[PDB]
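G., before I forget:
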Amino acid sequence: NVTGLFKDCSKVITGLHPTQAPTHLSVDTKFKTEGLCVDIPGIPKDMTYRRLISMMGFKMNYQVNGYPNMFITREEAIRHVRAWIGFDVEGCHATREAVGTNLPLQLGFSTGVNLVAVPTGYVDTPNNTDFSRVSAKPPPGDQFKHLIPLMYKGLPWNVVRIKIVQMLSDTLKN
Amino acid sequence: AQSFLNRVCGVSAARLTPCGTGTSTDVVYRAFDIYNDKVAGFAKFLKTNCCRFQEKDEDDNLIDSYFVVKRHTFSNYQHEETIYNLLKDCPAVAKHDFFKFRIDGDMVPHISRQRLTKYTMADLVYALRH
Amino acid sequence: AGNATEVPANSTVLSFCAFAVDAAKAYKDYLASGGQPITNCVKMLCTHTGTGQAITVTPEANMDQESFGGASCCLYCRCHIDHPNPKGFCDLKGKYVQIPTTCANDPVGFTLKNTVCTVCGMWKGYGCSCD
Amino acid sequence: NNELSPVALRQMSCAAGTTQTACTDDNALAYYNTTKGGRFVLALLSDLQDLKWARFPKSDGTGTIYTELEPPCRFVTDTPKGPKVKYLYFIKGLNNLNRGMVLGSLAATVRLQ
Ligand SMILES: [Zn+2]
Ligand SMILES: [Zn+2]
């Protein structure tokens, strides 16, 4: 069983020289001979690969008291009004270089707001990940034709989070 | 102008000579086989979404080969791309080349079909049946 | 599309290191927070001959220890998260890591708690002539 | 320069199975075109490993058709819990035209792996 969590998103299928893959699955079948990996001087390592990576399949529910478990159960969210505010986002997938990832484009809440933003994502790089901006298109569904004029006019993340936390800091500050 | 004309001579046989106009398209009277949803037939339209370059020859004689560069939608630019990128093998495919170029402040895409032929099988079959 | 990657069984684990901003003390509290380890580190193979320097281009190992990969040994990069590295990523991405037999259960806490000594190039204490 | 066909091919659910009698009344997904001759049927979509026959009431509901199926085409759709295997049977001896327009409408509807 494999994950869409951290599932690679670019179409390139050439496995990583496992010195550039942080998991025992992202190694090409050139190193796995009877469940073990053997160093190969027959080919040097690679430095040319820029792939976005999926960010799904989380299911966050550790168990400690040093953090309070963010998700509140049935009552602990019914009891506490003067906090209810919506949360929903619309997304899309990339075109040429890659596809298979979900990324936000417009964010709506209870406040009569719908924020625009250009898509960006964690591209994998031989040193770490970079936070790169990639071509975007909505899903091919025709009911997403309303989503056409949103990809070429969005916003990056910094200004967006400033404005969002500030919508917070004047609407929910009360 | 030339940097363009240069920049679409890509890497090969830089002997070009735009029998077009400048950096504008062309107007050709060509006999298509067409069938959208509304029109249909085997008929001779006036087509114009193309810039057309006649590749010349050493000794600077003309020579039957062409670079036909078309300009259309970004989205469609991608489709054509990913397709071409799937299929750049079976030799019956004219070797395309994509790029993005600027006209004014406009980053217009461009596809460059390389070494074709002034006519097409259409003009043959048509102007032999009719 | 792309290529599969993580085990769903350690999803929760990486989840705690995906959304964390103090992820180091976080994941050490996780190693000590009712769980079993990140059961996916690349398992290398060598003749176990050479010095003890793990950070090596081609496995440079001892008879006791055992080698995993170089990259698959930093959770800061194992989770694609941001780094507090000054400029601006993690070093061990590209080499190998030969950990001595005891502490070689998980190399994340190893790479974060220990760090190579400039004198013998080994992990500080496993072993060293450092006075 | 010559676009093919903007579509209108509907999709229903009905009956298919492995033999003439094995066809349970609800397990298959018909893709079809109601032409001059009733809801004229084109292709089958399923999740089962194999279905070599299908059964559908007529134009007015006289009898049940005994339309066999193709060695199904293999592919995987996506459902919120990962990939999901699916097969695309065709009604045998169906030329390239309707195979093509069916693939068109279908791959349009369902995004694969
Ligand atoms: Zn790191
Ligand atoms: Zn030392």
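Residues C 74, 76-77, 83, 90 surround zinc ion (ligand 1) (CB under 6 Å). Chain A touches chain D at residues 4, 139-140 (CB under 8 Å).

More on Monday.
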